[PDB]
Design a protein around this ligand. Structure first.
Ligand SMILES: CC[N+](CC)(CC)Cc1ccccc1
Ligand SMILES: [Mg+2]
Ligand SMILES: [Mg+2]
Ligand SMILES: [Mg+2]
Length: 340
């Protein structure tokens, strides 16, 4: 029963959830990976990992992915949550040097992951293992695009480190631009391609309908995270959230800000419904009778179908995951699943 302020009747009615058939094995295999890579302590893995629903989030998204592709995506996604937690803890504890060194290591590992599989920082080693596996599915040109995108993500996290240590809340437009990077919009968009087995040509993935559908799926995911994660973030002195920027820069009340974020999220849905018609028409057009055309058509159709699945997977994840259940914590500023 979704809280009334967070409920989206259009998602519930018109975006039925899907779940990949590999999910049961995925749940246990990513938990074992978090344990074996020492990304969380064993007692915290046992108590909290399944309840965090990280594998459920990806298995509701990349439908049709080969099992090995889904496994690498799920491990990387769980890694990305643990990295968000490390970044938060380094900010809270004023560990500017530790963050700077981790930032530099991630840039280097991203370009040479095999070299870093046994690094002394288990967070770097776990990153490198997941990225090396993601780099084994498609040509080097896709790997280079993933790396270009993630270098940009790392730098967006560095900007957040400086904003939070200096007390700065970004302006609304500044925030919206930063949030496309901190939520990793273009990484999730890149990962559609190994999931459907095809690196798309620039001419296809930059088609305006593919681009706009991809963008709106990610804006929904990030802004719905902002809507649902606002309480945990206020409690933890996090400043990065569309609602916080609106309160600060536009002088809205909390209630006014939550309503404006919710309206922005609802508009993403109905803008997506419009452009989805065009992106599926484009998938139809690619099927021109040729073998290549059929391949590209099926890949675009699968990817646009997963851009739609992201809406329902992200919506339910925020009500199922222990990650956001701040009311259940003894110390609302310190989630129990982080290493403090
Ligand atoms: C910290 C996790 N994330 C990606 C999973 C940062 C890249 C933001 C996010 C959280 C939840 C749903 C959508 C995005
Ligand atoms: Mg966070
Ligand atoms: Mg973050
Ligand atoms: Mg958030």
């Amino acid at each position: 029963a979704v809280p009334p302020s967070l409920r989206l009747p259009v998602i519930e009615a018109a975006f039925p959830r899907q779940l990949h058939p590999y999910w049961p094995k995925l749940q246990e295999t990513t938990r074992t990976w978090l344990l074996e890579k020492r990304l969380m302590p064993a007692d915290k893995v046992e108590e909290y990992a399944d309840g965090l629903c990280y594998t459920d989030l990806m298995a509701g998204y990349y439908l049709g992915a080969p099992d090995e592709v889904l496994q690498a995506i799920a491990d990387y996604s769980a890694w990305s949550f643990v990295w968000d937690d490390r970044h938060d803890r380094d900010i809270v504890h004023g560990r500017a040097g530790a963050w700077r060194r981790l930032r530099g290591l991630l840039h280097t590992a991203l370009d040479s992951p095999g070299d870093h599989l046994h690094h002394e920082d288990t967070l770097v080693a776990g990153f490198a293992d997941s990225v090396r596996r993601l780099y084994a599915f498609l040509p080097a040109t896709w790997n280079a695009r993933f790396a270009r995108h993630f270098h940009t993500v790392i730098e967006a996290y560095d900007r957040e480190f400086h904003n939070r240590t200096r007390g700065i809340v970004p302006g609304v437009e500044e925030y919206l631009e930063l949030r496309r990077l901190t939520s990793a919009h273009w990484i999730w968009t890149d990962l559609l391609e190994p999931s459907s087995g095809c690196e798309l040509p620039d001419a296809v993935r930059k088609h305006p309908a593919y681009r706009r559908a991809a963008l709106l799926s990610q804006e929904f995911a990030a802004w719905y995270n902002d809507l649902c994660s606002l309480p945990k973030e206020i409690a933890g002195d996090e400043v990065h959230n569309l609602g916080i920027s609106l309160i600060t820069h536009h002088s809205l009340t909390l209630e006014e800000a939550i309503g404006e974020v919710r309206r922005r999220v609802e508009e993403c849905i109905t803008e997506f419904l419009a452009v989805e018609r065009d992106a599926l028409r484009f998938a139809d057009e690619l099927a021109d009778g040729t073998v290549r055309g059929k391949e590209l058509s099926g890949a675009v159709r699968a990817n646009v179908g997963n851009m739609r699945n992201w809406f329902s997977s992200v919506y339910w994840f925020h009500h199922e995951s222990g990650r956001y259940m701040v009311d259940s914590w003894d110390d609302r500023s310190t989630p129990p699943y982080v290493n403090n």
